[PDB]
Design a protein around this ligand. Structure first.
Ligand SMILES: CC(=O)N[C@@H]1[C@@H](O)[C@H](O)[C@@H](CO)O[C@H]1O
Ligand SMILES: CC(=O)N[C@@H]1[C@@H](O)[C@H](O)[C@@H](CO)O[C@H]1O
Ligand SMILES: *[C@@H]1O[C@H](CO)[C@@H](O)[C@H](O)[C@H]1NC(C)=O
Ligand SMILES: [Cl-]
Ligand SMILES: [Zn+2]
Lengths: 597, 176
């Protein structure tokens, strides 16, 4: 009789029907991704459209049960996930237009090219033409052209669309009783109605801003050390007190300084810890890799992979007759089916990646006994955080010694340790001010704190102050540079990349703590530690059925994000950087620019 | 040999009884479950009984746990219930090789909703629409009106907990 009992019944019907349709879509999507044919792609679209239509219909029926009259929270959660209105609450005219913008912006980024001035027939797309230049060119002017011509040709197209995109999204969020579309985005961390686990939407701002303050020292000393090393590669163009030219950072945006290792490697003449040679010399294959990965998770008390995995997963390239999609994926088809799609090759990067993707299966398996709507990470950051720590332990020479890929006569000198630690920081801590600043911009744009006639100004004002990066060419409001990045033009939240990183190292400290690890946090291997496995398992089993605060607290013992584990991981590099910067300015000035002279 | 080797079994909600009365069964070792609740298997073959009934059906791997006295859930409350004083044996084995096809075998069904729980050894095959709301259904599906039976989808790639299992339940009169 009660609405909660009715909702209980509706979800009971959903969960059984949804599990089947999803498994149908999963099977078809699998066939395409393993054998790209016109037949299998037509099945993938039909199965998807069926699953989608079902999902839309259920969402409309789900709203007929008001969650204002439901007390069971694991039911109120499931209903909340179904009756997400989205752009349904907007007028049918505006909704039609908003989708036209979204599909237009996506296709400008993906199907937009710029031809070089020297040869008007050889035109280049962002992928692979422009990204190859930004990731391999050492010429200041070649880099400058690609960086500028992308932001001027493609970016200016996206400017009038992103202005319309901001207005319509904000109407969609105010109609959904949010304050702005950025507040809507911060809902993915909200928790309400649980004593001591509530997490407001505005809280995510305070935490990110205060937790970033404690990264500022390490970043400055990294940034100082990179601007130093970059002055050797690009001599005349960089000032030892000014920001870094945006087109010199290894990719199109400076999101990752990963590509700068070749120029910034501290001790270049020492080799990298690469057991790729040692594996091939023992005639390893993809089978042996995933066995060792399976063996790793069993060592902490997690189950070994189901026989379905070993029989159905794609673990090699299936010849040259049929083409797959080797982008490493970990499938959770449902109905107890778990698979990893990977064209594995005998290297170290794949050995690591295997441990990463199997960790995704481990998470997928542990909450498979949850209701269908609650089979997911505790929040957007949890899933990749789990997959990453499985590569941390597996990479250490401690672990490589355990399995026989490294001789017990190994020299772990402080130099290769810092070489590796620097490589890490370029990717991990390099992207942290980038990711923060990009989202903070959008957060003030959606809130109206940045007028349209100051978008590009306030953009570079913050790129200077926060990231320490400066434009090589001045940009008025005809430009739209943030829209030149995938995640912005394609309407995706970006703060997930900041939290995912901090979470990752929170897990790794708490696990290495339970694993009685002695030395620094960066040499830890949680293998053979059942106390760590259990401590991790008590979070994986939860899925998204409980607040992310509690799920985090099941691993680390605290109910909130923290950064000091990240700093602790990099603290040996922090000191080395502090010492090499005695003959260089630490920090930057927001006034020097290459164009003003 | 024709209640165990039958090339198709009955749906759990419409379970089939067939009177077996007319050790080598238990020494097969190919049975995944052989849980008796009256006397040990090696014994009953030399014990006094008048009536032996075999109730046979197919269910999910995870649901085999429910074919036992005192159990609760969808299969126990709504499909096939065993009494607390059950005297007999429960046999189950994996049937994925037979009851799951590449396209997906949707033939086997089960009862998902019912107004009340089945009494021991009761059977219900009614297809009358379940009414979850105050307003009556009058024999049409819709909002708060669900067709009570639902279909098992068995694929050869399904997980073990989702694979089909053939179940045979032996019931003994146990004269005294
Ligand atoms: C990290 C660690 O100690 N791993 C050990 C490995 O060294 C040993 O060879 C194996 C068998 O004893 O058990 C495990
Ligand atoms: C030991 C035993 O009972 N084996 C039987 C076999 O004789 C029969 O042919 C088959 C069904 O065709 O089922 C099994
Ligand atoms: C919500 O309903 C589920 C139904 O299985 C039940 O297990 C759970 O205890 C309920 N939560 C409550 C009553 O807080
Ligand atoms: Cl059935
Ligand atoms: Zn991943």
């Amino acid at each position: 009789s009660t609405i909660e009992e009715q909702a209980k019944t509706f979800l009971d019907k959903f969960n059984h029907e949804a599990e089947d349709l999803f498994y149908q879509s999963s099977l078809a999507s699998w066939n395409y991704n393993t054998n790209i044919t016109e037949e299998n792609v037509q099945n993938m679209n039909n199965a998807g459209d069926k699953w989608s239509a079902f999902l839309k219909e259920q969402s409309t029926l789900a709203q007929m049960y008001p969650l204002q009259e439901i007390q069971n929270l694991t039911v109120k959660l499931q209903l909340q996930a179904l009756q997400q209105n989205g752009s349904s609450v907007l007028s049918e005219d505006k909704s039609k237009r908003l989708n036209t913008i979204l599909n237009t912006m996506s296709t400008i980024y993906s199907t937009g090219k710029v031809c070089n001035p020297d040869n008007p027939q050889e035109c280049l797309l962002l992928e692979p033409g422009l990204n190859e230049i930004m990731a391999n060119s050492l010429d200041y002017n070649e880099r400058l052209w690609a960086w500028e011509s992308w932001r001027s040709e493609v970016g200016k197209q996206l400017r009038p669309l992103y202005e319309e995109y901001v207005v319509l999204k904000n109407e969609m969020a105010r109609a959904n009783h949010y304050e702005d579309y950025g507040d809507y985005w911060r809902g993915d961390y909200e928790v309400n109605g649980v004593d001591g686990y509530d997490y407001s939407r505005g809280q995510l701002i305070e935490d990110v801003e205060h937790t970033f303050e404690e990264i500022k020292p390490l970043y400055e000393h990294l940034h100082a050390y990179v601007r130093a090393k970059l002055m050797n590669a690009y001599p005349s163009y960089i000032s030892p007190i000014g920001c870094l030219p945006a087109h010199l950072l290894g990719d199109m945006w400076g999101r990752f300084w990963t590509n700068l290792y070749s120029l910034t490697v501290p001790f270049g003449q020492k080799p990298n810890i690469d057991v790729t040679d040692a594996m091939v010399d023992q005639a390893w294959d993809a089978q042996r890799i995933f066995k060792e990965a399976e063996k790793f998770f069993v060592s902490v008390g997690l189950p070994n992979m189901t026989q379905g995995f070993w029989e159905n997963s794609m673990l090699t390239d299936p010849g040259n007759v049929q083409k797959a999609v080797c982008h490493p994926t970990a499938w959770d088809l449902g109905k107890g089916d778990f698979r990893i799609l990977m064209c594995t090759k005998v290297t170290m990067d794949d050995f690591l990646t295997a441990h990463h993707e199997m960790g995704h299966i481990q998470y997928d398996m542990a909450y498979a006994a949850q209701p269908f709507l609650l089979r997911n990470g505790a929040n957007e950051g949890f899933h990749e955080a789990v997959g990453e720590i499985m590569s941390l332990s597996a990479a250490t020479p401690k672990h490589l010694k355990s399995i026989g890929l490294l001789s017990p006569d190994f020299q772990e000198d402080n130099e290769t340790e810092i070489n590796f630690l620097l490589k890490q920081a370029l990717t991990i801590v390099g992207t942290l001010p980038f990711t923060y600043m990009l989202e903070k911009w959008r957060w003030m744009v959606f809130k109206g704190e940045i007028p349209k006639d100051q978008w590009m100004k306030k953009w570079w004002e913050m790129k200077r102050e926060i990231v320490g990066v400066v434009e090589p060419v001045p940009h008025d409001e005809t430009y739209c540079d943030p829209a030149s990045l995938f995640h912005v033009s394609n309407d995706y939240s970006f703060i997930r990349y900041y939290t995912r990183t901090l979470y990752q190292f929170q897990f790794q400290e708490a696990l290495c703590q339970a694993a009685k690890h002695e030395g620094p946090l960066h040499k830890c291997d949680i293998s053979n530690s059942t106390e760590a496995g259990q401590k991790l398992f008590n979070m994986l089993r939860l899925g998204k059925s409980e607040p992310w605060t509690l799920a985090l607290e099941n691993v680390v013992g605290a109910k909130n994000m923290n950064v000091r584990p990240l700093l602790n991981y990099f603290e040996p590099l922090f000191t080395w950087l502090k010492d090499q910067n005695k003959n260089s300015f630490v920090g930057w000035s927001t006034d020097w620019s290459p164009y003003a002279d | 040999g024709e209640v165990f080797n039958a090339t198709r079994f009955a749906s759990v909600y419409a379970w089939n009884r067939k009177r077996i009365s007319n050790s080598v069964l238990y020494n097969s070792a190919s049975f995944s479950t052989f849980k008796c609740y009256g006397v040990s298997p090696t014994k009953l073959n030399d014990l006094c009984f008048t009536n032996v009934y075999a109730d046979s059906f197919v269910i999910r791997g995870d649901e085999v746990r429910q074919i036992a006295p005192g159990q609760t859930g969808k299969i126990a409350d709504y499909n096939y219930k065993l009494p607390d004083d059950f005297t007999g044996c429960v046999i189950a084995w994996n049937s994925n090789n037979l009851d799951s096809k590449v396209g997906g075998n949707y033939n086997y069904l089960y009862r998902l909703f019912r107004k009340s729980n089945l009494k021991p050894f009761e059977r219900d095959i009614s297809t009358e629409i379940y009414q979850a709301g105050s307003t009556p259904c009058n024999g049409v599906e819709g909002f708060n009106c669900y067709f009570p039976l639902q279909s098992y989808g068995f694929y050869p790639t399904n997980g073990v907990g989702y694979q089909p299992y053939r179940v045979v339940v032996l019931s003994f009169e146990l004269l005294h």
